[model samples]
Target: SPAELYRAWQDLRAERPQLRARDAAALLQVSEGELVASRVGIDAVRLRPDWAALLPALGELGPIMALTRNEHCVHERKGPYREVTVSANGQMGLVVSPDIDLRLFLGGWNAVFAIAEETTQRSIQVFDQQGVAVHKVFLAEASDVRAWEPLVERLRAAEQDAVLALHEPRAPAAALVDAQIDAAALREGWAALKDTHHFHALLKKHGAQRTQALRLAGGEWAERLDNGDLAKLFEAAAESGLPIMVFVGNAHCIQIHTGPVCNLKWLDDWFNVLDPEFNLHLKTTGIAELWRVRKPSTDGIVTSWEAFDPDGELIVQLFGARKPGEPERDDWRELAESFKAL
Candidate 1:
């Protein structure tokens, strides 16, 4: 079967030399790993899935671009991999550099490949067990391409089989609290939240869903907003030169952009920030709900615009750029309040 699939992929790729491996693999209905593994002895080399060793080595490669995405959105940011750390259990990791901020979910990440294109382009890409891309790093013009070969040689796996062991389909999240749940206790827990990071734990403790908690937290804390507000918010940030943070991700990686965005463009259903060194592409039509969410923090109340798709999955989150010990920017807050509220 591997031989048959490999031949089919080769035929398809020869006919469409311009196709990316991801797209090519999709056409064959096989995991990208399988398609890439088909060429193990060619332009691609399978690498070990050792996150701890692989992540730290990225810094030596100099400036690079990192990309992460889900079905509806794509996030790209450029910077060297610095301040990287991985948990001993290998379940969590972080890239805390100012230029590239990322939250790594390592469980689903099961494959790695170093790709060398004929155009002199080079990259290292990671994927989940299903062969969907989890995260990718591309060498920039300023990157140390001189180091690429040695690094690849060091990380390459001894067993370079193209086969992959994918995890089973993920189970659905546990049900949220019902109407009969303790609304008062949920509200109290929400009110007690001191940091935005603790919001998830609060929801879990109260057995509450995000939207339901918003409803119970009262209109003062969270309210519905027009989906169009997403575009307007970006336009405002770009117009006023207000730095903002944009978070976009899938199940395995969360890519972040923290800076002022310019060159906003919209083509049909897509809204995009086409800035040098960073780009964000979002499908406006894919958005089914938008919420103006607020939370208490030690610095002050932090506000964000959260967007979701039809399945109630978060598409992305936008927040005014502010670091710890600094309060939310007044201008950013004012701009958020100007949006048409529910």
Candidate 2:
């Protein structure tokens, strides 16, 4: 049994040596890819899900960090796996790197690992088919440790299995409730939007439920904010240089961070963005609801700032770095009217 769950996670890391591999597989119940497939040949190695050829061979391991998360934000981003592409039915992927950006869905990538920690901690980790974690890739300190084991011996895995058939985290469903939707046909299909991914098929054609169509998209398309107004909108996007974008994701990778966010920190209940190549934390008590939505796009009214959790799910979102037909960043729409409706 993965060698008894790898000796019960080395006896809970010799009694919590700062336990964190997702809280030591949540105190050993298991599934942090079953304790990283129970440490495959001890410091992990498995790998070979091909993710469009090992994620662009991780730009030859030259400088990495990447990490992406949800369950309340984590985003880190050092840099290197540059310009990756994918899509011809590989179920989507991209990385327009200005420093390793990403969006890859890869139709739920499942198992992959290459760790190496004994403190030298090299990395590569990705998971999904219920084993959770969606992206990771640390190896900084100016990476390229001689192309890490010839790129892990050319993408290892020929069954060096410690086992993982895991599949049990599937539970979110019940959601349509603004009196069972149709707030004027969901605000006339959110004012017949033209882009912004057609507002998720106009909330799946009126089956509405993203914060219940932002609590009935009335205030000219959603408003109700103040989940501590995301620390004053990152203290006004780090003092008005607002090149915002940040995205953060799970349910299969979505890390993005497009320019400008000077350093900002908060510690204790978390809220950080220590920028040196992007890093975010935000567990501001798992932000229970916050908005600012505004949709109708034809490159006109785009706006965002969503945050959610406390079961409405989405734990991070923000926007302003416009591109496609560009329009929304007039100082990120006057950086939310210079902070008022707190």
Candidate 3:
């Protein structure tokens, strides 16, 4: 079944070789073989493992909420964006959209709009690049013995009955997380876990407490706070007269030298200076000068995931700290380093 699906993908790829495996997979969901086959030669296939902890968060359901917008009603327009960066600190940044130079089919679009509608309402199950089910929800949705119900049925029909599951494999123990972490216990156990490589060990060491401090140190995350500084970041940008679409983190503490500050108001205030049209000016111009705090920023950027399993897939850390001599850098790189990379 997947073989046939893959054959179709191969045929299309032969005709238009630039299509990515993900694009192909999204195009043809029926074929499992073609999907895996496309990934056979990818380097980033290996990088996916670096981002597993975020899968649970990704699978949570709801209409996406924007963190900051210059105008309350500025729904994110569908288009390509060069990069979008979010951090545990109240920072959400996106590079200029409509990256015409990046000709890839989806490269220039805003991820806020690019997510497929069908999947938008449906939560995703996290899987490793190898197609191994790291965590599964139910019998019909995803199971250790068989993945995506259709694929499982196909395998059973083909008489390959002895399919394996992660439950059968050495698996990370199931742990409960309700989006918030325990700050007290985390502050106590964070230091040692940061130096170690064991995911579960760290989880166990802290007694599985869902503390904000522990999650930040362990690389799990929470929502960005809606407060004065964050509101002011948007307020300042509006004051500057620029339409803002800012990006930052999902919310987990990385080792920023700034000593685990939550809302780096001083820094946010810097970039928020996009233009100068504060609320006082809105009435005169027939424009609504304002900020749109759409949703609590809950995108997780836990770096320990790759260490847990190399096959983990993560949302790309779109902006990394720049080493000197790395020209053509975005402002966020320096911002990230100033906090953690330093």
Best by TM-score: 1
Arrange candidates by TM-score, descending.
1, 2, 3
Candidate 3 weakest ten by summed lDDT: 253-262
- Model 2, 1-342: lDDT tens per residue? 888888888788888878878878878776788788888898889977888888888888888888888877898888888888898878888988676788888877788989898967888888888887889888988887998898898989888877867666667666765788778887887888888787878888877768888888787788777788787788778987778888888767788888889988888999898988988898889888788877887878887788889878788888888777989877887786444443
lDDT at 130, model 3: 34
Backbone-clash count (model 2): 0
Global lDDT of each candidate: 0.86, 0.82, 0.27
In candidate 3 the C-alpha lDDT for residue 235 amounts to 40
Off by over 4 Å in 1: 10-24, 177-180
Q: Once all C-alphas are superposed, what RMSD does model 2 give against the true structure? A: 18.2
Q: Which ten residues in a row have the lowest lDDT in candidate 1?
A: 172-181
User: Considering only N, C-alpha and C atoms within 3 Å, which residue pairs clash in candidate 2?
Assistant: none
| Position 186, candidate 1: lDDT | 76
User: Pairs clashing in candidate 1?
Assistant: none
Candidate 1, residues 44-143: lDDT per residue as tens digits?
Answer: 7889999999998999999999988777888888989887999989889999978889999998888999989776778998988788888999998999
